[PDB]
């Protein structure tokens, strides 16, 4: 019953947004700042390109 | 500090004091391809006809 | 006389251009970084997106 879980206010998943993207001739470049707030962790597994 | 530690005025001439700066250190005669460092010139013998 | 307005250099306007932008379908993203330097505050009534 404690100890695990948050009782605050806080999002599941995370959608980011390029911050600067290069359309190519044969290749795409997508840069984006993953933010990891404070009192989080982030298990790389869990991240993937839409 | 967020205080800028540039103060700039429209009546200073930084361009021009590079230039003279650098002849006084110097060899404007050589060529720097880094700075693009290649003194404007013109031909002796095109300036005075002799 | 004294302790209302700075003597010091500063600007009365300041402008901030988006960090990252997010044109979509039905909507637009604009995220700023809304920086208020030292010994300064800011009236929130005073902004405005342009």
Same mark, same amino acid.
């Given at each position: 019953?404690? %100890?695990?879980?948050?009782?605050?206010?806080? =999002?599941?998943?995370?959608?980011?947004?390029?911050?600067?993207?290069?359309?190519?001739?044969?290749?795409?470049?997508?840069? !984006?700042?993953?933010?990891?707030?404070?009192?989080?962790?982030? %298990?790389?597994?869990?991240?993937? !390109?839409? | 500090?967020?205080?800028?530690?540039?103060?700039?005025?429209?009546?200073?001439?930084?361009?021009?004091?590079?230039?003279?700066?650098?002849?006084?250190?110097?060899? =404007?005669?050589?060529?720097?391809?880094?700075?693009?460092?290649?003194? %404007?010139?013109?031909?002796? %013998?095109? =300036?005075?006809?002799?």
């Amino acid at each position: 019953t404690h %100890d695990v879980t948050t009782d605050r206010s806080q =999002r599941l998943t995370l959608r980011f947004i390029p911050v600067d993207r290069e359309d190519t001739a044969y290749s795409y470049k997508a840069r !984006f700042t993953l933010a990891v707030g404070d009192n989080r962790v982030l %298990d790389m597994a869990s991240t993937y !390109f839409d | 500090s967020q205080l800028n530690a540039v103060v700039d005025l429209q009546d200073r001439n930084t361009e021009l004091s590079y230039q003279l700066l650098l002849d006084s250190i110097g060899d =404007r005669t050589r060529y720097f391809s880094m700075w693009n460092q290649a003194v %404007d010139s013109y031909d002796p %013998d095109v =300036r005075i006809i002799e």
